[PDB]
Amino acid sequence: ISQLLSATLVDEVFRIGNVEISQVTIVGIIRHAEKAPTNIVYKIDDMTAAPMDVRQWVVVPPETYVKVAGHLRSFQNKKSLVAFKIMPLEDMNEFTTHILEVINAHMVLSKANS
Amino acid sequence: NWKTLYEVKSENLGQGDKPDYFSSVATVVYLRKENCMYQACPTQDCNKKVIDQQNGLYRCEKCDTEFPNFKYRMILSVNIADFQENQWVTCFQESAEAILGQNAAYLGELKDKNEQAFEEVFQNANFRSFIFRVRVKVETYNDESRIKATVMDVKPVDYREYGRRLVMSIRRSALM
Amino acid sequence: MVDMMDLPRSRINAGMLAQFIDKPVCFVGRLEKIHPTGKMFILSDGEGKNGTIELMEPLDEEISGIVEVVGRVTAKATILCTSYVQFKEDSHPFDLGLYNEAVKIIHDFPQFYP
């Protein structure tokens, strides 16, 4: 979530560093959620920046780890996420693996663009 | 044999005259929801799609017989995506039943009895991660050469060994 | 003063406590012992080292196993815990050595992990 809030917005497609992104997935702990007749908003925290917001259209109880995959949106210059699917972790090793997946992913492409 | 879709498409894989095999881990993005199930022959083995006789009876050309019953079977085309590339592969009954987490007959009944649950099966199966063993070869059709990919095995992921491989690659690769 | 919940909480092991004084941190370890008045306990990391946890109120819930706490590093090389949460291991064990290796990885090259 640290590098999502730092993403630039150009011609409707967001970029990070020297790489484009349109579909992303992350893992974090729910903090709070509210019910709406049409959608749901969660405050997902991964402990590297303030709780981001994720929006899903028509509930996981708080304090639970989850993995999400979705789209990046900007509204009034405020970053947000629209999530296709949210899934609670069962094996706790998933996020330990994800931490290494992130560094592998955002490191391999950097040299390719070099 | 560990491979990455980018290297598969960029390291001269599948373009050869022999079917090459590779194994990799990737996430499932899209599942073709239509044109997946075709009625099949009750016998134990036949490389033939049965043909309807429109009288409650079916015929097989390869064996030239007629039976009053048909067996469902699965052919699925799916797109697998990773952190750098995506690829199209096709799955038969063995791998399709694993990915959908269901047997062929149950899904066959569901599609013709409960379409919403049929869709929900693909939805739930969507975005999951599996360890994929696939083979790729070039097929000639109407004088066009293109690579077709078929899935051999589908299994869940080994998080511990996956992380160990990732960390070993990271430490080794960077220090070069 | 600003709430610590909205800061870049770092992830570390017991051995790095001497270089992150007064900054928010995130600690992962296995429960070892509980002080008899319910106002202190100790956790251990992959290397086997230990760090002590301090709190403000007595605990009315029994806790054991892998523990997740966040707080501020005090002057005594200790953690002033503000919140804690306990993972779920009902079906798999947590490869804490792997997590320790991952945490060692993050601080090696932070550019890819801001």
Residue numbers in the entry:
A (entry chain B): 51 to 108, 119 to 174
B (entry chain A): 441 to 616
C (entry chain C): 1 to 114
Question: Which of the paper's sentences describe this entry?
Answer:
Central to these functions, RAD52 promotes the annealing of complementary single-stranded DNA (ssDNA)8,9 and provides an alternative to BRCA2/RAD51-dependent homologous recombination repair.
To provide insights into the mechanism of annealing and to determine the role of RPA in the process, we next determined the cryo-EM structure of the RPA–ssDNA complex (3.2 Å). The molecular architecture of the human trimeric core was similar to its yeast and fungal orthologues, with ssDNA bound to the positively charged groove across RPA1 DBD-C and RPA2 DBD-D. Additional flexible densities, corresponding to DBD-A and DBD-B of RPA1 and the winged helix domain (WHD), were also observed, indicating that human RPA is structurally dynamic.
